[PDB]
Amino acid sequence: GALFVHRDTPENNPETPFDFTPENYKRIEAIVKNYPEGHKAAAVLPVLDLAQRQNGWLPISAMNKVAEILQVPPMRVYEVATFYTMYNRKPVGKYHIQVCTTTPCMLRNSDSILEAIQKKLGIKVGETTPDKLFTLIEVECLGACVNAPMVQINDNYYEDLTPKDIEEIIDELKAGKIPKPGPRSGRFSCEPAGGLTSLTEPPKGPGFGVQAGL
Amino acid sequence: PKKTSFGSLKDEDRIFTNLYGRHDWRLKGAQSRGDWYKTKEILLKGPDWILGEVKTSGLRGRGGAGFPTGLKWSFMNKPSDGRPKYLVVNADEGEPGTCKDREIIRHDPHKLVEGCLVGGRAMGARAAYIYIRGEFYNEASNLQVAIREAYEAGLIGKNACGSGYDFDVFVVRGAGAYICGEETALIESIEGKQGKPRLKPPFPADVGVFGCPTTVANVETVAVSPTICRRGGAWFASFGRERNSGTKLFNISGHVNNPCTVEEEMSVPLKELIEKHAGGVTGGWDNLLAVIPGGSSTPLIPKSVCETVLMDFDALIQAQTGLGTAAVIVMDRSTDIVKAIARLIEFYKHESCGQCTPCREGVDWMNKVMARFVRGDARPAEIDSLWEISKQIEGHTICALGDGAAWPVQGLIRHFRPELEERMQQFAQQHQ
Amino acid sequence: EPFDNTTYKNLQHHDYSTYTFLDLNLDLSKFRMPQPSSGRESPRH
Amino acid sequence: SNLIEVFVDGQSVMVEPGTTVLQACEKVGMQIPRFCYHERLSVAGNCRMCLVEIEKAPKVVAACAMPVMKGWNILTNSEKTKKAREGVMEFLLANHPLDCPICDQGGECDLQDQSMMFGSDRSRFLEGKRAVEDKNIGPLVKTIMTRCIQCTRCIRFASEIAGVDDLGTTGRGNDMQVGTYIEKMFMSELSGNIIDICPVGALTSKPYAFTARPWETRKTESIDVMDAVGSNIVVSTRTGEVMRILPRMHEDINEEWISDKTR
């Protein structure tokens, strides 16, 4: 676990089947055209992510296939896959819970959120449930510190959590439901709870404050 | 003449008028709030006029370094040597305690897009690559949707806004590395390599993304340029102190009653900012222990300093700290200050790109010492040892992440040495 | 005209899917200007 | 004509524009310390062992990567420069293993020598050391990666000289690891040269392992006859027995490389 050397196994080896779907090949050629001609290696990061979105993780076969279509040495893709944390080089559950624990979230009792999830799913940090449904890890600042504590599940943020709000979210995910992203408290995104302290007046119109020339 | 006290900014002076996302964030909403208004006339005045307005406004980088933005954008105001010229907008937003750049992207994704065109025009760039954090998936989508509308409205692309200037705006998502916020490490990430910063003096304005001239500018720095060009650099300079001009976004998080993100005039007193907007410190302005005024990178300051310090570059520098990203982290007297700063050093040890020696080995070394200070399993003589190790990282690394990991330790030992030594006495008498 | 300053107006992201971002990038290819070239297919050519 | 005057310790030297601080110091007989800079590889600037002070500037600059500017005075022996080399050497040796008696590089190791000349004389590292798993890359090059100092010389050599992009860095931070990730053999006609450029004993010769120490070998400067290039070699002998073959620099034939057959 957490190793940066690949050892072949029956479930992960260069013969493991992987290939982009015909729809994804149209997405790859759109990504590849966002960069100057002669610099197709610039598309490794988005095309590796696209491979993970289709598959859910990155088997060694997936890394090699991205190297082939971009004409980049495979070792250069292995460097990118091992460098960035979001890339999954080992299978994860369909719901990847990522609990922030850096100081701004740690100050607002983000450890209680982590304990609640651990007790509910009956696992420890870094493990997966026996049904391959939930995987729990701790991440660094996710850019939502004012809404601390918070977790990320797949592509969505759940914020202003308490040991009860997080448990409800897992219940909706666990059975069949898709909880709505956003703070679980009474505020919407980041405003001061208890009433706006600014931006209460109507916004000005098209051309307020314009100088002479412009 | 000049002012002495700062703060109490009127909503008619605020730039991000949809900060809380309570109006339409799409093109129609942005235009009704002044965005994309008379943008063609800005372009036709040429790069010199646009660069002049930013110079006059005294704007300084909002990413954490605070270099004069108007002066920094003039390196790309040179003739063409045959290479394309790009603009890279830094939306990585990885500094702990920092959330401002999330709201600009998610709720005003047309001041940013308009900023790219105006900022790109000043530098003479052909396109803008916006590097957005990989965890901000939903924010990146709204940014893409706004970019699509701008294309359909003719605001960007071929013949932008009817000005005869071609400009394309691309969005490239990261993959989960804090170091990719560094300007050169951001460029190396766009090029498909590891997020490892480059060395200088090959500067991005001379050899940048794809080995071409480039400017790396923060989202907030780029998202206020069109307003300055319209309302003028004189208007922007009217706020904050001299050399600290402008309005600044603030993220007040931690042990405050109402953690929030608000816009406020530069040089605003730290005490006023927390009290007025954040609802004060949990337990009043007597439970306050320390504050990190500019994100984890900046050193903490104790309550004594927080009484009168003003939130601007020069004032916080004199307080032995920095403004950084204006990410105010508040810690009260129930906080384990040693443990709070230990987690920050663990953060930098998980975000060190690992390229250069001092931060590859030094940060991992500071983390282990801090992990022992928390428990008190150390001698008082190791505090000075930790200080010296910190000064061997600062200034000897390729990028400023190493510096950003030294400063938090130095702040802890500067103001809270008595706490560290007491922690060690308790362990010594117990574990005889 | 209704100044309903008490409602969140950024709920479009509750419906985004796992391929929303890349689909938008695909839709934008028809608007992009021609990319520049370094004169070679790769640094290894 | 186009030469620009720069000063090394106050002594004036005329250099071409684009000359690095390290190269300017070479023209006056001063060799800046180094672990990642090799004159035949691309500049990397990640060991920081070449940090040197420039008079009237507060920040030390990397000598291997910084071009000199007209009028600069390079202080190769100032207090600030000397404290930089001690700090960097302290970091290099923090996690380095105590393998010197069992390590083939001992006695001809740059980390050892530059630690004697530029580093401190004692340790204040009170933690546990890092340990990395070895990586088999063939029958010629022995790999003990706990001794690696992440200098990336092998990475740059394999890609620029050999033309094989099989070595890289997998990981991040203090867990960054040099290797092939997959189980692969770095098999090439120039593969044996990574043993010479690796400043430490992380990469060593497997046929030569444990047989001799550097100080007891006699260096006979000879020629190679495995091919028709005529590479200049050094034949190491010990008590009447050939122990190994090393490259000998010849700028016009082989530089400091030899083929694996010659080695």
Ligand SMILES: Cc1cc2nc3c(=O)[nH]c(=O)nc-3n(C[C@H](O)[C@H](O)[C@H](O)COP(=O)(O)O)c2cc1C
């Ligand atoms: C370790 C590290 C992380 C950084 N992260 C960011 C970031 O997330 N957003 C940003 O605008 N600048 C960031 N910076 C600063 C950039 O390197 C650069 O100074 C800035 O983006 C330049 O744009 P500006 O003029 O708007 O400040 C970071 C610097 C370092 C050393």
Ligand code: SF4
């Ligand atoms: S200081 Fe750390 S993050 Fe910055 S370049 Fe050096 S090793 Fe990488």
Ligand code: SF4
């Ligand atoms: S590489 Fe050098 S310093 Fe390290 S164990 Fe071997 S001889 Fe000693």
Ligand code: SF4
């Ligand atoms: S194995 Fe040797 S040459 Fe390669 S990076 Fe490590 S120390 Fe440098």
Ligand code: FES
């Ligand atoms: S510290 Fe948790 S989101 Fe920033």
Ligand code: FES
């Ligand atoms: S020799 Fe200059 S940093 Fe390594």
Ligand SMILES: [K+]
């Ligand atoms: K060696």
